[PDB]
Amino acid sequence: MRITFNDVKTSLGITESYDIVNAIRNSQGDNFKSYVPLATANNVAEVGAGILINQTVQNDFITSLVDRIGLVVIRQVSLNNPLKKFKKGQIPLGRTIEEIYTDITKEKQYDAEEAEQKVFEREMPNVKTLFHERNRQGFYHQTIQDDSLKTAFVSWGNFESFVSSIINAIYNSAEVDEYEYMKLLVDNYYSKGLFTTVKIDEPTSSTGALTEFVKKMRATARKLTLPQGSRDWNSMAVRTRSYMEDLHLIIDADLEAELDVDVLAKAFNMNRTDFLGNVTVIDGFASTGLEAVLVDKDWFMVYDNLHKMETVRNPRGLYWNYYYHVWQTLSVSRFANAVAFVSGDVPAVTQVIVSPNIAAVKQGGQQQFTAYVRATNAKDHKVVWSVEGGSTGTAITGDGLLSVSGNEDNQLTVKATVDIGTEDKPKLVVGEAVVSIRP
Template sequence: MPQSKLAKATTEALGHQVTDDQIFKNALDSMGPENNLPGYHAGDNFVPYGQSFLNNPETYFDYLNTIAVKYGLVFIKQSLAQNPLYNFKRGQIPYGGKIESVVFDTISPKVYRPDKITGSESPFAQNFGRVVGKTYTQWFDIESSNTIVDTQDTMFFQNLQQFHDFVYGKVAQLVNGAVLDEFYHTKLTLSKSLADGMIAKTTVDNVKELQKQILYYARRFQYFSRDNNSMGINQATHVSDIEVLVPLKTSIDIDVDFVANAFNPELFKATQVHFTEVDAFPDVWTYSADHVVTSDDIDKGYVDGRVHPVGSTIKKGSIATANATDAEQKLVGDKVGAIVLDRDALQLWDALPLTLSTINNPKKRYTNIFLNQKTALMFVQALNSRAIMLK
């Protein structure tokens, strides 16, 4: 029997066969006996259940709520939209804690001189090694919703597969939108850090030179050096923690054999790093001065009135929309040929993981499905990172 998109996604996420019948039965069981629906068995005619949903919007709401919560991780894991940078996720921020990556610089030894015992040579003299914790943090804090009209949307399903396809599609609309938005803001965190000088830069003339520089820094990062990051911290990165991010525009020009060889565990054991392709790195525009929001800013789409109402002030240096008043371009994303970085340089911490919930309006017979997420997107300047720029 054909599977719905919900059943297929659940099967792929769990690694074993899950049918629409099982999903339906498990959901009804989770709702409890008060759902006023008869017990369901595999192969039962869906029509009477559909009729019950049509006549009891609250029961339909309970079912949607159960599916959204119970299968929330399935929707997220199997979403059509994917965030290639998801591997930078670190988990959830500890309650009440502030995430800060502390980096320790090395201390250079001196030649032994037993005759020097005063001043800075005294055994009681204090010598504080350099400890750096500078990070750029951007909060990704979102909400979205999707509405299902109970007594209208349930009228058109002739079987369980069609019903689950619809439910899956409505939830997937929310999840795909959130995943795409998080992906964009993760890339924007890198672009903004680069624009602000937090990532060291090297400029090349062509793709062949780009290939050499990717390989050079993928190896160079494994050796202690003060040239591997913009703060001059003496750092080395373990080979398994080296990431190479390449935009599609340059990725298609990079020699296939180069990628196969340079990151082949057998041929180049010392350069086995993680290679990730992204669609593009965003341009960066920032406000060159404190900007007071006007109605014109909102009307032209330069500013979101929900976030910055008329009369509010956007601080100098804040991210701006392209060509907005008082904004200047700080980075052309297409000039970024690749970014080589320590995996810990980019960190995504969830204050609230992507979460689904529902609310029902019985008077108007509709259900709202809500999505919420709050994530800290962080870049650690003191760890190794190098952007290879194209002229």
């Protein structure tokens, strides 16, 4: 079989901003006057950018002879992912990971007249759980047809180098895809509205506020590690604590350069104006608003289940097949602190969290729910509660107390909604919880 091409131009997919040969020819004392004395300028400009598809060229002196190629160079590259340090061990058996967290309780006023009748009363501890599963199962497939590949080389060294490059491409692809999956984790988390958003663009004073972003980042990092804890920085609304040595700040190259040229080059004793967490620089995020993300070491929940490679030879077709199987689980923990720095515009409310998300009540019982809205601004918004159970008799008050009718058997859905849009154009942010009924 012969594969041949005809009528191929040197300027195949080139869009010209301007014609350099015409500019040189038509220059009159312009910046192109330096190239006027050059004699073989058109020939250099015609083929100086390289050729995509080559064709046989006859020799200049003798038209019968053809021109040969005198050099062959093989280009090699090796890639790694910089986020591999956030991975955990392996899971050889099982599929699901369970994570449990016990929160804090409230203080009760001291009383003896009341205590004399409720000694054996019980108070349910507050505890939440979430689950992680294996979700990545892929393989990389390539083929090597060495007998058909022999004709493209005249040197065994070049042939072997090309085969080795083909082999290395598989591992390069695996590393690149792993990095992209890890970045997709953060982008998905931001897209689902589970971060706490801090604006780093609006300043508090028009007096040369070129340090507003670094001041905000420093303050946020400082208040992330207050000893008494807080429940404003995690998507499960649990009072937790962070440590300074376990905080990782993933930022952008342009942000790093901006900080370095703006504050570090002009600050005396720059230790008072640097970042606080462990800094890792990447090539930006996918979402519009993200500029930097500050997370905890326990935020990542990435494990690898399988890594293997297997080959098979086709003797009728005279070739080799390589398969590289990778199985992994990629997830994040909602119990860990995570904040995202935004330099654009954001909605008034990002999410609403109902603290009891799973409940089981009897036909005459009651359940109390609490709601936490994540408002970017300082404006306070009210929640409204509803129940989509269906039976008549079950009702929820405005505070968040749900009572269940004595005759009812179906799964109840408790919703708390907040309105942030205008009239006739409503926009709603909803938190939800599920209630089962004991018989």
